[PDB]
Amino acid sequence: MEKYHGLEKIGEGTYGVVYKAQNNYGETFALKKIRLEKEDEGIPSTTIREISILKELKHSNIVKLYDVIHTKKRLVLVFEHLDQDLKKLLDVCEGGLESVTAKSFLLQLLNGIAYCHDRRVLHRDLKPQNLLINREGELKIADFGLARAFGIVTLWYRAPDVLMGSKKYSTTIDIWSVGCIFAEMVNGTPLFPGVSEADQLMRIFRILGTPNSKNWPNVTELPKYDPNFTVYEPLPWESFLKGLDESGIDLLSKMLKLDPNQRITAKQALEHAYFKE
């Protein structure tokens, strides 16, 4: 356990319960007790190793992992504590964020991602709840790399190719989520709030158009691709986005390309004109 007191439950996180706590030095940390479906199974050394290496992620926009505590059918991660997150902030911001705030958060999000991508660390489950924010306006991404360790579900930020069964390692998956979060920051409301895998795809296609072999070569090789998908044409960007100037729309359009091979990278996004304004 490593000597923590005043364990206060502050949330249900993705893989388990998050507590705020203090060590015996007075300092505040977040403790994430990973929920073990099968207690008796144990955690293998490969898993511990793939979590422990995340301690090497040292970046101002990545939540710092301090410790991995494995004792007796219990696994707790000790992380830097931040008091706020983007989900809770958006929940009290009618209409979404002011454009200068969304840009600031987007820049920070992309910087964290770019850092991780350069180290071949993927997130795969980016969402507002894991973008933590401190009193100074600094955004820090939580849970990067945990998907490689650990694999009712929120499908809102999942890329179409992922929804259609793609299993490959790819950085592109995260950029799709960024695009969805960007739109949510500017609009207030989530862009594609699907209730099932099928409905999630329809929500995306109703806005951006149904894929076909011409706008997404090789889309037909995906295991859950469906040649009978309803065919929708793309809507004009300005019709479902509010509060975004032309550079902003352009950038967003590059993140929400359906074909992952044409989707902008994090580092490319960072070079976009939207950020020089």
Side-chain angles (χ1 to χ4, degrees), residues 106 179 182 186-187 208 235-257 272 274 277:
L106 185 65
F182 184 14
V186 313
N187 286 343
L208 300 175
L235 302 186
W237 291 96
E238 304 79 16
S239 68
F240 60 91
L241 290 154
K242 136 176 102 230
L244 221 42
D245 65 23
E246 198 80 334
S247 269
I249 293 162
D250 184 79
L251 174 59
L252 173 69
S253 80
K254 307 303 188 217
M255 304 165 163
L256 296 177
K257 294 268 179 185
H272 195 275
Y274 177 67
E277 298 166 357

Side-chain angles (χ1 to χ4, degrees), residues 6 29 83 115 151 187 197 210 228:
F29 303 89
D83 282 354
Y115 173 86
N187 286 343
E197 298 180 32
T210 292
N228 308 308

Side-chain angles (χ1 to χ4, degrees), residues 260-272:
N261 288 339
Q262 300 299 331
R263 194 168 304 142
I264 197 164
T265 73
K267 267 177 177 178
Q268 293 168 350
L270 283 177
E271 308 188 323
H272 195 275

Side-chain angles (χ1 to χ4, degrees), residues 101-161:
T101 303
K103 172 178 305 195
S104 173
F105 291 162
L106 185 65
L107 178 66
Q108 297 183 68
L109 173 56
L110 289 167
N111 271 286
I113 286 168
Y115 173 86
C116 290
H117 285 184
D118 275 351
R119 296 151 172 79
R120 296 197 177 111
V121 179
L122 299 184
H123 197 289
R124 295 167 49 223
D125 189 36
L126 285 171
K127 60 199 167 201
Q129 183 164 86
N130 57 37
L131 303 188
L132 312 189
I133 300 156
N134 71 13
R135 272 185 275 219
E136 296 77 29
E138 266 200 293
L139 175 151
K140 293 191 193 211
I141 307 167
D143 295 347
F144 237 110
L146 290 188
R148 200 183 172 202
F150 304 135
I152 322 197
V153 162
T154 289
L155 296 178
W156 299 358
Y157 308 100
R158 294 218 182 154
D161 65 292

Side-chain angles (χ1 to χ4, degrees), residues 35-43 72-74:
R35 166 193 180 173
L36 316 171
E37 198 50 41
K38 317 179 236 120
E39 175 168 35
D40 306 290
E41 180 154 353
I43 294 154
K72 296 257 165 207
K73 326 187 167 188
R74 305 222 161 183

Side-chain angles (χ1 to χ4, degrees), residues 1-8 19-29 31:
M1 4 176 340
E2 208 73 41
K3 327 197 170 164
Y4 298 90
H5 77 288
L7 268 67
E8 176 184 355
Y19 300 87
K20 190 168 164 213
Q22 278 171 12
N23 53 23
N24 230 357
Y25 316 51
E27 333 172 71
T28 294
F29 303 89
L31 297 187

Side-chain angles (χ1 to χ4, degrees), residues 45 58 74 195 266:
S45 76
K58 287 151 173 208
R74 305 222 161 183
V195 300

